[PDB]
């Protein structure tokens, strides 16, 4: 059925229908445009008029311009053949290949499938990075954010995990869904080339949204990605790893429209709905029904202005099972990966460690290294206050341990460390500390492993 525009203000367009009003969420198509222009119904204003939000620019629209109702919202052309393809934020080909041949056509908001089970995340995902696998293990079904800032190699880490991740002997096949949001043409060309050259593309679906793509397409990108992941996990029984960079850029777009939508702004100019939209994305992870598959997330959260308290990165922490926080200060000291060892945590870590999983001494070693590194970092402050020579012999050992932790445990010369390798390095550096100062390792472990 067809309607006519009665008002246009930036991204918001009002459209009057003489017959049949399109329901909220329907995709409408503007007639008379060179490129497809979608209007998503947001409200029924009364008097046969609906209020909509445009998925692309509204320059050149005229009052009276015609609009058709497509009869449905937007969707994902779901198929196992999604693997090996590079697509836009909307799921249109970017690889010069034909459009996807759907096995099913799925809504993308998270309503389709109802895939999740009421079971806890469990079992190992080998990223191939020692600072994740050994000390902050990623588990199937978990949401483990990379916490970074502008200038830091968070995207290099994200791409490396995409190339390397696997689920070591699992009866289930493994797949990656890689979604990039608001990236440059140069970055898009780089990501494409990387997936194609390495052969990582064979087991991955890639969604790329450019900075100059419509803001609405950026908002839809993570939803296309999560829907594909849930389809592969639930209908094909796969362990799927979803990598989303950068959530902060997603937020900049969602924030950009909140103003055009008429809302009173919240703190820092953000949308008042920041946490309940973001919840629609972090809720979508975990084991799927049947327990053959799972959806795991590695979202990238860059600190705007390096501020981890900004509402965006701060609200993301609750959606994760493991967090890796990168720090500019550490990067400027030449320590890469620039992980803050006293601000990276594992929420579900205890579910993936110990006898029959990693090794019985894993929790004790992790606790002792964390405690010693935190003390060592504080002592760097104390050295600055009093001078190196005024530090006690005991404190000097903890000071030195912090350097050893950074030089040998954090730093990897690119290199796939087994958990056994990572625990060995951990015990080697721990020897620097007095045995009498290992408060967090029971004597049983000292005798057996020291």
Partner 1 sequence: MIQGVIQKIAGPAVIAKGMLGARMYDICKVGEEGLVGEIIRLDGDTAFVQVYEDTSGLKVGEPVVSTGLPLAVELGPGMLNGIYDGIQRPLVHALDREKKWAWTPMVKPGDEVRGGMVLGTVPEFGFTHKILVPPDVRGRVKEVKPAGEYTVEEPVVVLEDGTELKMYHTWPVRRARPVQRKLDPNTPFLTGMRILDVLFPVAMGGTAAIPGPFGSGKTVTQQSLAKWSNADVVVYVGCGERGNEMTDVLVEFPELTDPKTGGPLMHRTVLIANTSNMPVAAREASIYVGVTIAEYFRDQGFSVALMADSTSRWAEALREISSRLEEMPAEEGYPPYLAARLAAFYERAGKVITLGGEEGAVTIVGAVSPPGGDMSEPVTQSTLRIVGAFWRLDASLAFRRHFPAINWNGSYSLFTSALDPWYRENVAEDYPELRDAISELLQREAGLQEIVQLVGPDALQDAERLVIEVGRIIREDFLQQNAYHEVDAYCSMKKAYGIMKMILAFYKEAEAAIKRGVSIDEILQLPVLERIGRARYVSEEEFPAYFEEAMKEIQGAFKAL
Partner 2 sequence: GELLVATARTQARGEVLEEVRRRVREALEALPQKPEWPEVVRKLALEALEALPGAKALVANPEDLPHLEAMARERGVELEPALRLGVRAVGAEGKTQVENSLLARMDRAWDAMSSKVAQALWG
Partner 3 sequence: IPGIRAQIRFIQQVLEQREREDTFRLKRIKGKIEARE
What does the binding site for ligand ADP look like in residue numbers (CB under 6 A)? 318, 345, 347
Token pair in block for residue 97? 């290949």
Q: Which of 12, 15, 51, 257 forms a contact with partner 1 (CB under 8 A)?
A: 51
* Partner whose binding site includes residue 307, from partner 2, partner 3, ligand ADP, none (CB under 5 to 8 Å by kind): partner 3
* Partner whose binding site includes residue 285, from partner 3, partner 1, partner 2, none (CB under 5 to 8 Å by kind): partner 1
- Return all residues near 182 (Cβ < 8 A) that are at least 6 apart: 209, 210, 211, 218, 246, 249, 250, 252, 253
Token pair in block for residue 21? 């009003």
Q: Which of residues 56-85 bind partner 2 (CB under 8 A)?
A: 84
Are 346 and 137 in contact by the 8 Å Cβ rule? The answer is: yes
CA neighbours within 13 Å on the CB side: how many for 254?
Answer: 21
For partner 1, the closer of residues 21 and 433 by Cβ is: 21
Q: What sections of 100-214 are H helices per DSSP?
A: 130-133, 154-164, 185-198
Q: Is 143 near partner 1 (CB under 8 A)?
A: yes
Rounded to 10 deg, the angle between the 247-260 and 274-282 helix axes is 140
* Partner whose binding site includes residue 385, from partner 3, ligand ADP, partner 2, none (CB under 5 to 8 Å by kind): partner 3
Q: Which residues of 318-328 are buried (b: 16+ CB within 10 A; e: fewer)?
A: ebbbbbbbbbe
Q: Is 306 near partner 1 (CB under 8 A)?
A: no
Are 439 and 378 in contact by the 8 Å Cβ rule? The answer is: no
Place of tokens 């079992």: 123
How would you class 317 by CB atoms within 10 Å of its CB: exposed for 0-12, middle for 13-18, buried for 19 or more? middle
Token pair in block for residue 1? 């059925």
Are 291 and 237 in contact by the 8 Å Cβ rule? The answer is: no
Q: Is 293 near partner 1 (CB under 8 A)?
A: no
* Partner whose binding site includes residue 272, from partner 3, partner 1, partner 2, none (CB under 5 to 8 Å by kind): partner 1
Q: Is 192 near partner 1 (CB under 8 A)?
A: no
State how far Cα 422 lies from the chain centre: 25
For partner 2, the closer of residues 106 and 244 by Cβ is: 106
Enumerate binding residues for partner 3 (CB under 8 A). 262, 264-269, 307, 381, 384-385
Q: Is 281 near partner 1 (CB under 8 A)?
A: yes
For partner 3, the closer of residues 265 and 434 by Cβ is: 265
How would you class 133 by CB atoms within 10 Å of its CB: exposed for 0-12, middle for 13-18, buried for 19 or more? buried
Place of tokens 């679906």: 205
* Partner whose binding site includes residue 228, from ligand ADP, partner 1, partner 3, none (CB under 5 to 8 Å by kind): none
- Return all residues near 32 (Cβ < 8 A) that are at least 6 apart: 65, 66
Q: How far is the CB of 349 from ligand ADP (least distance, A)?
A: 7
Q: Is 370 near partner 1 (CB under 8 A)?
A: yes
Q: Which of 9, 18, 150, 168 forms a contact with partner 2 (CB under 8 A)?
A: 18
State how far Cα 271 lies from the chain centre: 20
Q: Is 438 near partner 1 (CB under 8 A)?
A: no
Q: Is 370 near partner 2 (CB under 8 A)?
A: no
For partner 1, the closer of residues 185 and 276 by Cβ is: 276
For partner 2, the closer of residues 22 and 244 by Cβ is: 22
For partner 2, the closer of residues 1 and 367 by Cβ is: 1
- Return all residues near 111 (Cβ < 8 A) that are at least 6 apart: none
For partner 2, the closer of residues 194 and 213 by Cβ is: 194
For partner 3, the closer of residues 118 and 267 by Cβ is: 267
Q: Is 317 near partner 1 (CB under 8 A)?
A: yes
* Partner whose binding site includes residue 20, from partner 3, partner 2, ligand ADP, none (CB under 5 to 8 Å by kind): partner 2
Q: How far is the CB of 194 from partner 1 (least distance, A)?
A: 27
For partner 2, the closer of residues 48 and 273 by Cβ is: 48
How would you class 34 by CB atoms within 10 Å of its CB: exposed for 0-12, middle for 13-18, buried for 19 or more? exposed
Which residues contribute to the site for partner 2 (CB under 8 A)?
Answer: 1-4, 17-20, 48, 84, 97-98, 101-103
């Amino acid at each position: 059925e067809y309607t006519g525009i009665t008002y246009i203000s930036g991204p918001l367009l009002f459209v009057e229908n003489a017959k049949d009003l399109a329901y909220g969420a329907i995709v409408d198509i503007k007639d008379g445009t060179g490129r497809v222009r979608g209007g998503q119904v947001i409200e029924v204003s009364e008097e046969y008029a609906v209020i909509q939000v445009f998925e692309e620019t509204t320059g050149l629209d005229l009052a009276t311009t015609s609009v058709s109702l497509v009869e449905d919202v937007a969707r994902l052309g779901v198929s196992k053949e999604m693997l090996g393809r590079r697509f836009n934020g909307i799921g249109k080909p970017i690889d010069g290949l034909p459009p996807i041949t759907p096995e099913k056509r799925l809504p993308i908001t998270g309503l389709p499938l109802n895939p999740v089970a009421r079971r806890k995340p469990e079992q190992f995902i080998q990223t191939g990075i020692s600072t994740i696998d050994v000390m902050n293990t990623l588990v199937r079904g978990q949401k483990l954010p990379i916490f970074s800032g502008s200038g830091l190699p968070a995207n290099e880490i994200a791409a490396q995990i995409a190339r390397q991740a696997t689920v070591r002997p699992k009866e289930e096949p493994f797949a990656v869904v890689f979604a990039a949001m608001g990236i440059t043409q140069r970055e898009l060309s780089y990501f494409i080339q990387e997936f194609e050259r390495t052969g990582a593309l064979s087991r991955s679906v890639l969604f790329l949204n450019k900075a100059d793509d419509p803001t609405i397409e950026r908002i839809l990108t993570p939803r296309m990605a999560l829907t594909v992941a849930e389809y592969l996990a639930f209908e094909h029984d796969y362990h799927v790893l979803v990598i989303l960079t950068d959530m902060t850029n997603y937020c900049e777009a969602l924030r950009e429209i909140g103003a055009a939508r008429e809302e009173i702004p919240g703190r820092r100019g953000y949308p008042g709905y920041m946490y309940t939209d973001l919840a629609t994305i972090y809720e979508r992870a975990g084991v799927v029904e049947g327990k053959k598959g799972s959806v795991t997330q590695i979202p990238i959260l860059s600190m705007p202005d390096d501020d981890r308290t900004h509402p965006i990165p701060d609200l993301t922490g609750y959606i994760t099972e493991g967090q890796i926080q990168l720090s500019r200060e550490l990067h400027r000291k030449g320590i890469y990966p620039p992980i803050d060892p006293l601000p990276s945590l594992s929420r579900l870590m205890n579910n993936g460690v110990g006898k029959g999983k990693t090794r019985e001494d894993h929790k004790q070693v992790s606790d002792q290294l964390y405690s010693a590194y935190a003390n060592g970092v504080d002592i760097r402050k104390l050295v600055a206050i009093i001078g190196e020579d005024a530090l006690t012999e005991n404190d000097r050992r903890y000071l030195q341990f912090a350097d050893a932790f950074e030089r040998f445990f954090i730093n990897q010369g690119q290199q796939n460390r087994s958990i056994e390798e990572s625990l060995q390095i951990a015990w080697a550096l721990l020897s620097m500390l007095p045995q009498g100062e290992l408060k967090r390792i029971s004597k049983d472990h000292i005798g057996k492993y020291y």
